[PDB]
Write a protein that binds this ligand. Structure first.
Ligand SMILES: OC[C@H]1O[C@@H]2O[C@H]3[C@H](O)[C@@H](O)[C@@H](O[C@H]4[C@H](O)[C@@H](O)[C@@H](O[C@H]5[C@H](O)[C@@H](O)[C@@H](O[C@H]6[C@H](O)[C@@H](O)[C@@H](O[C@H]7[C@H](O)[C@@H](O)[C@@H](O[C@H]1[C@H](O)[C@H]2O)O[C@@H]7CO)O[C@@H]6CO)O[C@@H]5CO)O[C@@H]4CO)O[C@@H]3CO
Ligand SMILES: [Ca+2]
Length: 585
């Protein structure tokens, strides 16, 4: 075995607790370079003579270059020292520890997880463990009160083609009037983009964090929204824009006024005075040369307590969580304290970050509860929409990501297809409903949290910013109701099948020629196998499935009963068909 390819660290996503007495260890090694992985361990302060405990490390999944092993160490002492035993293809042996490799156990040293403080066991909202979030871009969702419409509001039709400054008049009263719809769909939470006062139509250049934007409503209307949704079993989440502020934010206006005497010059990153005009700014902004969005200095104690107060004010209205916009550009101290503050007010308040790269550092259990799974989106786009990769590359991608973070965080990533920052998925599919559906079928059955972008469930389509921000389609005979009834049924199942919301994932078949992929979700004795024939040509496959985990399954989407004929399963899928096989348990 190529030792230079065996990885593990007594922390991060390879060593962490799932309980005050249970530690999850994971090891990494070159694909097919290691056949068995066992973990010999015991209490740290144990005598050199006592007998070590054993723990078999099942192969959890396989990257495109690695194999991932995973074991669960029972640690009543809440302290532990462990060493890996790695067996080769033919039979070779080797011990893996902190000191290094050695055919001799003792000479390999031993990894140590110093102590398991219950306060550090990565914990997350239970409701968040089985949710189906629906993303709402308020300005375009529904105009329930045309009296607050901005000036210039354009028509509300299927053929609108928005500009970077267009307005259509969607407001919070519309969202309220639409809860019957949202509740019929089955969503269990709504994620709004910025709803706070701002001159723009997207509202990321916040003018006042303490007031809903006039065009959308007023606090009374909001509270009504929160109450109306709650009794409907729908939680609500807001976009926290703490990285930068709109150049209307009182504090910034002051610096623009009082110049050098402003009591807030250190609330921003001013290079020189006086502040500036057009995109030739002289104060640090989000991205590059964006005047309307000066950068907040969350490192400054004053700014921190301000935004924290801002956070206290909205959690007082009963929201259920936050979506941290541009999260990675604001310090960790901030986020840790933010988590403590939030978690104290409401233990079930969800904190989801928005980072477009390895989030490992914000997913240890002391900051975010999760993030947007852009990866899943990249994998799904290229497997179902643009056909740029195949069933096997897909399997690889799903697995590689799936191993990035501690399970707790993994279990909750927001699996989105598209956002208000991208072309709609249907468009990505060149308008191929068949393909689109298969992707949704995967989304509603894969590991994580499904995130539905308003419109998709109905068949909307469009380019990227701002064509993806068209107004919702409400005229029923202008909506894809067959697709809607599809989402409904998946979501129904997802809520009904435990394994889909609380089980794990395991590859079950990857045929790059047939371009058919299949996985299995498991929890307790329940097994739900999803088969995706992602190809435009009926096909038949035989999948391995030992008589132990059941030998008879039932397709949840058709009610067809399938039987295992000696460990094998013969399935025939119509073009692009998918099957939700349930073992009944
Ligand atoms: O006026 C600015 C912008 O404001 C609002 O954007 C939001 C956005 O909706 C949020 O989701 C979020 O997204 C951030 C990410 O959090 C951040 O990490 C980073 O991520 C990368 C982007 O994903 C990537 O595309 C690129 O950004 C480029 C972009 O590709 C360019 O096309 C260009 O974007 C311009 C837009 O085309 C234009 O519509 C407008 O955007 C509004 C937006 O409508 C509104 O929702 O202006 C921008 C120019 O600023 O430039 C950007 C950056 O140069 O690279 C980044 C990281 O390298 O960026 C995205 C946003 O791009 O937060 C933003 C702002 O709060
Ligand atoms: Ca309106």
């Amino acid at each position: 075995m190529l030792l230079e390819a065996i990885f593990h660290e007594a922390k991060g996503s390879y060593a962490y607790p799932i309980s005050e007495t249970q530690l999850r260890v994971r090891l990494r090694a070159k694909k097919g370079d290691v056949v068995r992985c066992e973990v010999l361990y015991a209490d740290r302060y144990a005598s050199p003579e006592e007998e070590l405990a054993h723990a078999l490390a099942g192969k959890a999944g396989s990257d495109e270059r690695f194999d991932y092993f995973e074991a669960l160490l029972e640690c009543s002492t809440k302290r532990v020292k462990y060493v890996f035993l790695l067996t080769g293809p033919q039979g070779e042996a080797v011990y893996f520890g902190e000191t290094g490799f050695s055919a001799e156990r003792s000479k390999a040293g031993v990894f140590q997880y110093a102590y398991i403080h219950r306060s550090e066991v990565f914990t997350t909202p239970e409701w968040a463990k089985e949710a189906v979030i629906y993303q709402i871009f308020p300005e375009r969702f529904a105009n329930g009160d045309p009296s607050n419409d901005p000036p210039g509001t354009e028509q509300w039709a299927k053929d609108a083609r928005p500009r970077h400054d267009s307005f259509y008049g969607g407001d919070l009263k519309g969202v309220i009037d639409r809860l019957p719809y949202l509740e019929e769909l089955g969503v269990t939470a709504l994620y709004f983009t910025p709803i706070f006062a701002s001159p723009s139509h997207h509202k990321y250049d916040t003018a006042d964090y303490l007031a809903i934007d006039p065009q959308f409503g007023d606090l009374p209307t909001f509270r009504r929204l929160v109450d109306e949704a709650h009794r409907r079993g729908i939680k609500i989440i807001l976009d926290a824009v703490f990285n930068h502020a709109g150049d209307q934010f009182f504090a910034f206006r002051d610096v623009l006024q009082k110049g050098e005497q402003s009591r807030y010059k250190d609330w921003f990153f001013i290079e020189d005075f006086p502040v500036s005009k057009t995109s030739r700014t002289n104060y640090e902004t989000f991205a590059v040369q964006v005047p309307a969005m000066p950068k907040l200095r969350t490192e400054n104690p004053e700014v921190k307590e301000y935004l924290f107060d801002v956070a206290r004010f909205w959690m007082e209205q009963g929201i259920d969580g936050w979506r941290l916009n541009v999260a990675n550009e604001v310090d960790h101290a901030f986020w840790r304290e933010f988590r403590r503050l939030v978690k104290s007010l409401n233990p079930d308040a969800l904190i989801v970050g928005e980072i477009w790269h390895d989030a490992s550092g914000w997913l240890m259990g002391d900051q975010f509860d999760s993030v947007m799974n852009y990866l899943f989106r990249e994998s799904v786009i290229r497997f179902f929409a643009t056909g740029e990769i195949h069933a096997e590359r897909f399997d690889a991608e799903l697995t590689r990501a799936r191993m990035l973070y501690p399970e707790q965080a993994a279990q909750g990533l927001w699996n989105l297809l598209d956002s208000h920052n991208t072309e709609r998925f249907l468009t990505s599919c060149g308008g191929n409903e068949a393909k689109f559906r298969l992707a949704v079928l995967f989304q509603m059955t894969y590991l994580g949290t499904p995130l539905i972008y308003y419109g998709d469930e109905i068949g909307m389509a469009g380019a990227t910013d701002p064509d993806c921000r068209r107004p919702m389609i409400w005229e029923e005979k202008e909506q894809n109701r067959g697709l809607f009834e599809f989402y409904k049924e998946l979501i129904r199942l997802r809520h009904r099948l435990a394994s889909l919301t609380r089980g794990n994932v395991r590859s079950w078949h990857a045929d790059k020629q047939a371009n058919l992929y299949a996985f299995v979700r498991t929890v307790q004795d329940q097994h739900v196998g999803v088969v995706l024939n992602n190809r435009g040509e009926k096909q038949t496959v035989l999948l391995q499935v030992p008589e132990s985990g059941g030998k008879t399954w039932l397709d949840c989407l058709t009610g067809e009963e399938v039987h295992g004929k000696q460990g094998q399963l013969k399935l025939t899928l119509r073009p692009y068909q998918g099957m939700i096989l349930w073992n009944g348990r």
